[PDB]
Design a protein around this ligand. Structure first.
Ligand code: PRO
Ligand code: PRO
Ligand SMILES: [Mn+2]
Ligand SMILES: [Mn+2]
Ligand code: NA
Ligand code: NA
Ligand code: NA
Lengths: 484, 485
């Protein structure tokens, strides 16, 4: 069958990937006792957008559920799936003649049918007529709440949909559940996104020099990913935190835009991941700007390396993700105590939620077509109302086929440290005089992407991780990849 | 005063630039008869967005009118200007404590006052109270139609605005008019955007090799612009058209995503422009993929070079922009005839609108904070209802301070050629035996950015342009070129 490919050494992604997703969705819907025979799934793709009121086009990136089902890159499409037969129909815009001048070839419907390996292709303006002739019992549309954004998924609509019976409740939990479990074809894509992003992280580690701006490495990362990987998009805005900025979890956005000069003695925390054909990667590397860990940097870094590998070593089916988060907290506390930042009973520190002062985010999250992938909190799975754990993006137990980030970190965040020092239940553990030295340190995060297997995990990421490996990487002369 | 700067060799942009824009807007409004004492201009900044229903943040780029007035890079702001006094107040979001963990320092209002050199800073939720205390006669908000997109500008609104008198008709044409005329401080920024984008285009010409994907050069261009220029955004999606894709005017979008392999013998048409602090650039370079122009390529290329230079030489205050478009059309037709593609009377060709077959877009457009900048068709300026000319993004007369692209091109577009061949009024001019050779050629576009001055123009762009200069650049021989004067 056909494949998506951006040539050179980029990955060929078979369109059969999306056919399998459609089949899996139908199989799941058929088993749902509420689903009527003759149902049709109706999804609406993303549309082209512009900046504000201008004609400045925004580069189009497909809506994630639509992509998962169809792999379609063009704006303005719809797609439907007959549940009982699995038959797929793509609806594409009927373009005006002037499109050939301004935008490119006006492809035939047959071109799209071949390209996407769907059963039929029709024009968008005929959607009501086509669906009417199919005589469906009900249209199943997409509406639900994303548990990371709190946004409501946009339900498909078209002129004449009011003449059909529409259900917008059944589909969302079923298609979400399908997305939670990655097929072998999807895993091949995620191995590739991890491979390219890993290579780009290594190039960044080799290129970092004291005196550079953070954004110079953002630029280099994205250039490697696009030119060598065919990754036109990143999975999220690059986080290139140097010095104290490494304590800011989503640093790099427009309000704090990777604009600090990297200084001798800084730690760097670079959390970046290219996106290929709407599939994510999400990797964090932490390292000294000057290529040599100080004693304090080594101690904090190796604490996080310890939790990283302890969590990865414990992960397997049946493990409760919140238990892995707590495992990381306990390790961090043990190590911070060894360093002299903390004193006293680690059991008591855990009871006082001290771990969350140093790791005020979730241990990690599902990853797929979105970096914070869907399905972390389906109905019946509750968010734990405690510091740190409440920021977990899933409280599920692990099962084969899930893809997770494993991203423990330790940070020195003044307002959290100050709150802890004011609370007698936590202050007794904190040694102010030692902690003082780490004010402004920033933090360390080590983030791998892994797949749960029948017996454990498969690690997708491949970057240097021990202190020696990182120092050796940064000292290498190779000068492969030299723009200009 | 304070400046925006991204360090290294990037441009320091004084925040005084935006203060001057506010002053100019107030000065214009004070002379406007529809404007009464005690009016306050109220603008709403852009807000943070995410991809669809996900939590994947989209990188925030400020709304252009708001940027022009305030230069503010943060999402969620509003800004007001007292017309009578010129006093400026910026409203910034009141952030949650958790912002300090996830997003960064929760800066004080005073930090923002100093950063932006405004007269006062307040929190957004206090806007109704703050405006109430000022007892304004009327709030002047933004609403109008963009003449390139057809979209309606987003008018400011806040909880309690219904208790004020609001006028949404006065402001738009006035702030648009201010934007049309660039200040010296704005020209400094546009000189810089052109400098960086020109350097990037030269790096791309040096790097292009047969067998590369078009997108490899998009990537290299954007990397030069960001890493060396501090340009986090491009002004528009890069157009990297090789071979027949060079005939597709806005090639490179998601439906045609710069994914062709460049072949020996192809022409390349690369239309790319970095954006710095929301100021545009827009440059097009055309060149042979293999670094050596064939005779046919040289002929088409030099025809567009001739029109480019003729227009730049004729541009000065008082010139009607559609007359420049017609000049380019006439030159293209003359040169296509000199190449044997066309024969007959060029006057007759012009009368039959044959130029538009080969250049089915406008000669050029205003440029500023938007690549297709505002104000090309103010009330009373009409679109010319002819092929080619109807795509002009302005029909105004040139005046000092305007910034224009000059972007003639010649393309070989099958459905347009075939229409002409089916039209007795046009068909006899075309020599099919020669034209057949140019089917699939794509096209050539040569685009400079210029400022209208008292004397003529100031050319902002600095890239190789003659065949000899381009061939030298591609061979690695950079800077071996002299700009037009
Ligand atoms: O948002 C999250 O869940 C993780 C935490 C560190 C950065 N990304
Ligand atoms: O849109 C326009 O007006 C010009 C034409 C060629 C590319 N940009
Ligand atoms: Mn992550
Ligand atoms: Mn242009
Ligand atoms: Na990018
Ligand atoms: Na992360
Ligand atoms: Na252009």
């Amino acid at each position: 069958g056909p494949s998506f490919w951006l040539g050179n050494e980029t990955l060929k992604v078979p369109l059969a990937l999306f056919a399998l997703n459609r089949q899996r969705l139908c199989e799941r819907l058929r088993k749902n006792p509420a689903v009527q025979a003759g149902s049709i799934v109706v999804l609406q793709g993303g549309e082209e957008t512009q900046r504000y009121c201008t004609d400045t086009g925004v580069l189009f990136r497909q809506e994630s559920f639509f992509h998962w089902a169809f792999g379609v890159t063009e704006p303005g499409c719809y797609g439907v799936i007959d549940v009982d037969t699995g038959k797929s129909t793509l609806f594409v815009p009927r373009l005006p003649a002037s499109h050939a001048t301004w935008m490119g070839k006006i492809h035939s419907k047959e071109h799209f049918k071949e390209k996407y390996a769907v059963d039929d292709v029709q024009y968008v303006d005929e959607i009501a007529s086509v669906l009417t002739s199919q005589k469906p019992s009900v249209l199943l549309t997409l509406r639900g709440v994303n548990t990371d954004s709190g946004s409501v998924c946009r339900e498909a609509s078209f002129d004449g949909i009011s003449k059909f019976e529409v259900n917008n409740t059944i589909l969302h939990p079923e298609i979400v559940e399908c997305r939670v479990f990655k097929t072998d074809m999807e895993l091949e894509v995620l191995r590739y996104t991890n491979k390219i992003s890993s290579e780009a992280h290594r190039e960044v580690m080799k290129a970092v020099k004291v005196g550079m701006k953070e954004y110079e490495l953002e630029s280099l990362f994205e250039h490697y990913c696009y030119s060598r990987g065919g990754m036109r998009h990143s999975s999220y805005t690059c986080i290139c935190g140097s010095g104290e900025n490494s304590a800011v979890l989503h640093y790099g956005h427009a309000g704090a835009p990777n604009d600090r000069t990297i200084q001798n003695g800084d730690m760097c925390l670079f959390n970046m991941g290219g996106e290929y054909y709407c599939f994510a990667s999400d990797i964090t590397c932490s390292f000294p700007a000057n290529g040599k860990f100080t004693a304090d940097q080594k101690a904090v870094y190796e604490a996080v390396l310890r939790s990283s590998r302890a969590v990865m070593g414990a992960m397997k089916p049946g493990v409760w993700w919140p238990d892995m988060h707590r495992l990381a907290d306990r390790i961090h506390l043990e190590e911070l105590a060894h360093m002299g930042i903390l004193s006293g009973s680690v059991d008591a520190m855990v009871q006082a939620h001290l771990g969350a002062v140093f790791m005020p985010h979730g241990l990690g999250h599902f990853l797929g077509i979105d970096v914070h992938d869907v399905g972390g909190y389906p109905e019946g799975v509750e968010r734990i109302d405690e510091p740190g754990l409440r920021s977990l993006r899933t409280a599920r137990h692990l099962q084969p086929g899930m893809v997770l980030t494993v991203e423990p970190g330790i940070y020195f965040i003044d307002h959290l440290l100050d709150e802890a020092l004011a609370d007698p239940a936590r202050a007794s553990f904190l040694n102010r005089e030692v902690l003082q030295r780490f004010r402004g340190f920033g933090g360390v995060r080590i983030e791998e992407d892994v797949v749960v297997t029948d017996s454990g995990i498969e690690l997708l990421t491949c970057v240097p991780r021990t202190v020696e490996e990182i120092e050796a990487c940064m000292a290498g002369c190779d000068k492969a990849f030299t723009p200009f």
